[PDB]
Design an enzyme around this catalytic site. Structure first.
Site: not given
Ligand code: A1A5V
Ligand code: CL
Ligand code: CL
Ligand code: CL
Ligand code: CL
Length: 317
Positions: A144, A148-149, A162
């Site tokens: 992932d 964003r992570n 994450d």
């Protein structure tokens, strides 16, 4: 028998009374992240923390998932990877993590676009490649990776987070299945969309998309295209467009991360090398108006704070 080395990571269990929640930083169906302060027992130390509480998500499945996250976060130790400081087994369990006060790198590039220079962008690419290379050394496939992570400790220092899709490469062969979903399709390698194959080299694909997010200042990949089309788009040979600031040098590296043959994609160690060469001469590799004149911060606010220590300097013996 011996197949894999023992994970001798320590899981620290913390008392509710060692820490305090000060503000909410965010919430979803996973629970609530608070900004807090952890004061360990007997130590004349104040550590700024993010406290992720399940929030009464008393599903036994959600409790299992957040402890799987905690397992991985307690097992990693690298400057470019977020570690877990400990857990608290109150009624809703709490994960205690390092405060990354500037937030996600995605929101940072959106907010600060007109003040981010080529040096910052290229250094962020180096740092993410170092953290991903560390995960590769630990045999972890992240699954992932996305802007964003990646979180921002300072503008000069980012870390990957994450771990709720992360899997050990060497975990029962079942790398043909939807572990944690099969859902971040616009960051996924084609083999992961079509076949559910996941590899370090499928994280390289996601790294390429992540770089593209940084170099476009947080633009959405494949904006307007539904996730159903993405596989066919990629099979027909189309890719994300060259960001305006990118020389062909930088863009060709992105393109190489999006090769159909996974083994023709670069390795993380080589991405470190290539982005580090470019980071010694930033203006040759990204063209940004105003670049010569950019200024991002380094300190923070903080209210009597004499014994504050960042978690990276508070090493457990
Ligand atoms: C989705 O559930 C969690 C979100 C936070 N996450 C995580 N990991 C390590 C450190 C860490 N620290 C942090 C997270 C944040 N935020 C946001 C992004 C909530 C702001 C504004 C300041 N900090 N400091 N967060 C793990 C997953
Ligand atoms: Cl650093
Ligand atoms: Cl664009
Ligand atoms: Cl150009
Ligand atoms: Cl290369």
């Amino acid at each position: 028998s011996m197949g894999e080395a023992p994970n001798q990571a320590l899981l620290r269990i913390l008392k509710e009374t060692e820490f305090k929640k000060i503000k909410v930083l965010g919430s979803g169906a996973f629970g609530t992240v608070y900004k807090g302060l952890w004061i360990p027992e007997g130590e004349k130390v104040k550590i700024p923390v993010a406290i992720k509480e399940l929030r009464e998500a008393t599903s036994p499945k959600a409790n299992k998932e957040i402890l799987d996250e905690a397992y991985v976060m307690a097992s990693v130790d690298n400057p470019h990877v977020c570690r877990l400081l400990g857990i608290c087994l109150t009624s809703t369990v709490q994960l205690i993590m390092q405060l990354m006060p500037f937030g996600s790198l995605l929101d940072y590039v959106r907010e600060h676009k007109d003040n981010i220079g080529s040096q910052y962008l290229l250094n962020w690419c180096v740092q993410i490649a170092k953290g991903m290379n560390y995960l590769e050394d630990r045999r972890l496939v992240h699954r992932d990776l996305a802007a964003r992570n990646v979180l921002v400790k300072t503008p000069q220092h980012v870390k990957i987070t994450d771990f709720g899709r992360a899997k050990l490469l060497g975990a029962a062969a079942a790398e043909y299945h939807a572990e944690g979903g099969k859902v971040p399709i616009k960051w996924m390698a084609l083999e992961s969309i079509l076949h559910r194959i996941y590899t370090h080299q499928s994280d390289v694909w996601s790294y390429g998309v992540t770089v593209w997010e940084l170099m476009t200042f947080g633009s959405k990949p494949y904006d307007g295209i539904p996730a159903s089309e993405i596989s066919s788009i990629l099979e027909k040979g189309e890719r994300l467009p060259q960001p305006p600031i990118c020389t062909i040098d930088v863009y060709m590296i992105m393109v190489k991360c999006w090769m159909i043959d996974a083994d023709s994609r670069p390795k993380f160690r080589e991405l470190i090398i290539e982005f580090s060469k470019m980071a010694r001469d930033p203006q040759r590799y990204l063209v940004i108006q105003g670049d010569e004149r950019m200024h991002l911060p380094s300190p923070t606010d903080s209210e009597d704070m004499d014994d504050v220590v960042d978690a990276d300097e508070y090493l457990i013996p």
